[PDB]
Amino acid sequence: TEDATDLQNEVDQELLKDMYGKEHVNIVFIGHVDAGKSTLGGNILFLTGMVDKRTMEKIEREAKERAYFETEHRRFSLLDAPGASQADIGVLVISARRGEFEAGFERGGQTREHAVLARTQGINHLVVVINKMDEPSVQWSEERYKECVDKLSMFLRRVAGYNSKTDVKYMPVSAYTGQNVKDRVDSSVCPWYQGPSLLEYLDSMTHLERKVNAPFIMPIASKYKDLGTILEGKIEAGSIKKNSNVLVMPINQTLEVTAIYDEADEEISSSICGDQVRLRVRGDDSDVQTGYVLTSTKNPVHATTRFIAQIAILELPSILTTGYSCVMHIHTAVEEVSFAKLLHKLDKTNRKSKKPPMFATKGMKIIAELETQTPVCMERFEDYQYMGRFTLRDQGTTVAVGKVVKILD
Numbered sequence: 107t108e109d110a111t112d113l114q115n116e117v118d119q120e121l122l123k124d125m126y127g128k129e130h131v132n133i134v135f136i137g138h139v140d141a142g143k144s145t146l147g148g149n150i151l152f153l154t155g156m157v158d159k160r161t162m163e164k165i166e167r168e169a170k171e172r173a174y175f176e177t178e179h180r181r182f183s184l185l186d187a188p189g190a191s192q193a194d195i196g197v198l199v200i201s202a203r204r205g206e207f208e209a210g211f212e213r214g215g216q217t218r219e220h221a222v223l224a225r226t227q228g229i230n231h232l233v234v235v236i237n238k239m240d241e242p243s244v245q246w247s248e249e250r251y252k253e254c255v256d257k258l259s260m261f262l263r264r265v266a267g268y269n270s271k272t273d274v275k276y277m278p279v280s281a282y283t284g285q286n287v288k289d290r291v292d293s294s295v296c297p298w299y300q301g302p303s304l305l306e307y308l309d310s311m312t313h314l315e316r317k318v319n320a321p322f323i324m325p326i327a328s329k330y331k332d333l334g335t336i337l338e339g340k341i342e343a344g345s346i347k348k349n350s351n352v353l354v355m356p357i358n359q360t361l362e363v364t365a366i367y368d369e370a371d372e373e374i375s376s377s378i379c380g381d382q383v384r385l386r387v388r389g390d391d392s393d394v395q396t397g398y399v400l401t402s403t404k405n406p407v408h409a410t411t412r413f414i415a416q417i418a419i420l421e422l423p424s425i426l427t428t429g430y431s432c433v434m435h436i437h438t439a440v441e442e443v444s445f446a447k448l449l450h451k452l453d454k455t456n457r458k459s460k461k462p463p464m465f466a467t468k469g470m471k472i473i474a475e476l477e478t479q480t481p482v483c484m485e486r487f488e489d490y491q492y493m494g495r496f497t498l499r500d501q502g503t504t505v506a507v508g509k510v511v512k513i514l515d
């Protein structure tokens with residue numbers, strides 16, 4: 107009465123990375139006139155293979171009156187301060203050095219202005235980086251750190267509403283020495299800290315504003331019963347609440363939510379994307395099956411039967427073009443998909459081709475138009491990666507993998 111193992115069968119050679127780009131994220135550093143906002147920036151760029159020492163060293167000093175970096179799964183465009191002009195991560199940078207820290211909380215202090223500046227830009231999950239933990243006046247003191255967090259914590263809730271148990275991530279770092287920015291500080295220097303580096307965190311946290319604000323989208327992953335009807339799934343976009351009306355596509359059926367449960371069967375009032383929920387719903391669910399998608403009544407997830415997509419073949423068939431029949435799995439979908447009116451090829455530098463491939467096979471990729479006999483929810487991988495990431499199985503055994511590039515009428 108369920109479904110396991112989605113596109114976790116993407117367990118394939120690591121040329122997944124090629125077609126399947128990294129995730130684009132917009133991050134912005136809000137800081138003081140002395141925070142280390144720039145040195146931290148510059149340090150991340152060098153530390154992350156983006157730029158050399160001499161370049162980094164430039165930026166460090168050109169702080170006197172679009173860049174980006176990478177991480178295993180994300181590319182982080184850097185925005186400024188005073189759609190993809192709206193940030194997904196707001197990192198307030200504070201200095202722990204005695205004097206500077208305390209300074210910003212007083213009168214000339216922009217710390218209150220910055221907190222408000224965050225709220226001004228839709229940061230409802232502020233990452234706070236407490237910089238300068240190497241400083242002689244800091245020495246990585248567990249108390250000086252824990253003194254700053256508290257102070258900031260009380261503060262932020264007051265001046266800008268940030269509740270620090272669920273709206274702000276605190277993390278000690280050293281932009282100058284690079285300690286805790288890429289690799290978690292080694293226990294030698296600081297024994298107490300137990301979390302991840304700054305980039306570790308940034309490379310995996312779910313709360314990305316753009317995504318948290320997008321229309322709700324949770325691919326149904328299980329039909330199993332309980333009090334009544336349940337529906338597990340990793341929310342991929344937006345948020346879901348209590349007593350919230352939700353759509354089921356492609357069956358355009360409205361349906362009200364009644365209770366949310368997490369990975370500890372404990373009733374939570376809400377949940378965002380990235381979470382792995384176990385929603386419980388109420389209504390005519392006489393047509394609700396795994397592979398379908400829960401979504402926003404106003405801006406629902408798309409669902410078509412014709413669409414473009416870049417495919418890449420695997421095993422050893424030789425099968426040709428316009429009429430290949432296999433299994434698609436995009437999210438938790440599982441639907442019939444017939445190769446139709448093809449278009450191009452691909453070669454090394456994600457090229458293309460001028461001649462519509464005769465066929466495809468063992469060692470080849472292509473941007474073909476596929477048709478399904480019945481609608482299936484999907485989005486441009488470019489827009490909602492998961493929701494546009496499929497694989498093709500044939501009579502029991504895997505054969506290809508693709509990302510849907512364009513959705514057709």
Ligand SMILES: Nc1nc2c(ncn2[C@@H]2O[C@H](COP(=O)(O)OP(=O)(O)NP(=O)(O)O)[C@@H](O)[C@H]2O)c(=O)[nH]1
Pocket residue numbers: 137138139140141142143144145146169170237238239240241280281282283
């Ligand atoms: N001890 C120590 N000093 C630091 C550290 N980072 C920066 N500083 C000092 O603080 C000064 C100001 O840093 P800076 O990053 O330029 O501040 P900013 O005003 O936030 N930069 P910008 O305005 O360009 O974003 C630098 O001249 C440097 O000497 C650090 O990690 N440790």
